[PDB]
Design a protein that fits this description.
part of a larger assembly; 2 chains; A: 84% helix; B: 55 residues; cytoplasm (chain A); mitosis (chain A); centromere (chain A); cell division (chain A); chromosome partition (chain A)
């Protein structure tokens, strides 16, 4: 009986530890959600610079087509 | 008969003129290539801006 009183005290300490672990795991997952948001923002910035490469790539090809002229209308696209 | 060394001096002057003119020809060609690269560069730059003029 008194030994079992000490046993339940051990279990009390264990439960306190477990509660802290549970709280920490919840906080961990919360941080993962926040992390995912920031990573999405990063990818957005990368997409922006991909747009920049699209600009210069079209520039280069447009010039090369004019530069490679070795033997029209004005219809273009103006968003 | 009268301008023998004078014509020798002329030969030297035209030689110097040939040197300077070759440098002019070369350097002008260098600048021509330079200008053509930067011209086509900014040309295509204007073309991209001329096509998709940003807000």
């Amino acid at each position: 009986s008194p030994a079992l009183l000490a046993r339940v005290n051990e279990k009390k300490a264990e439960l306190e530890n477990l509660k802290e672990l549970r709280d920490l795991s919840a906080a961990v997952a919360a941080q993962m959600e926040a992390l995912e948001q920031k990573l999405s923002t990063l990818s957005s910035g990368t997409e922006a610079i991909a747009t920049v490469l699209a600009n210069w790539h079209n520039v280069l090809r447009a010039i090369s087509m004019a530069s490679a002229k070795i033997p029209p209308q004005t219809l273009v696209r103006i968003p | 008969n009268a301008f023998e060394p004078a014509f020798a001096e002329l030969a030297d002057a035209v030689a110097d003129l040939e040197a300077n003119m070759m440098h002019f020809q070369l350097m002008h060609e260098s600048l021509a290539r330079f200008s053509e690269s930067f011209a086509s560069f900014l040309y295509g730059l204007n073309m991209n801006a001329f096509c998709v003029d940003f807000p």
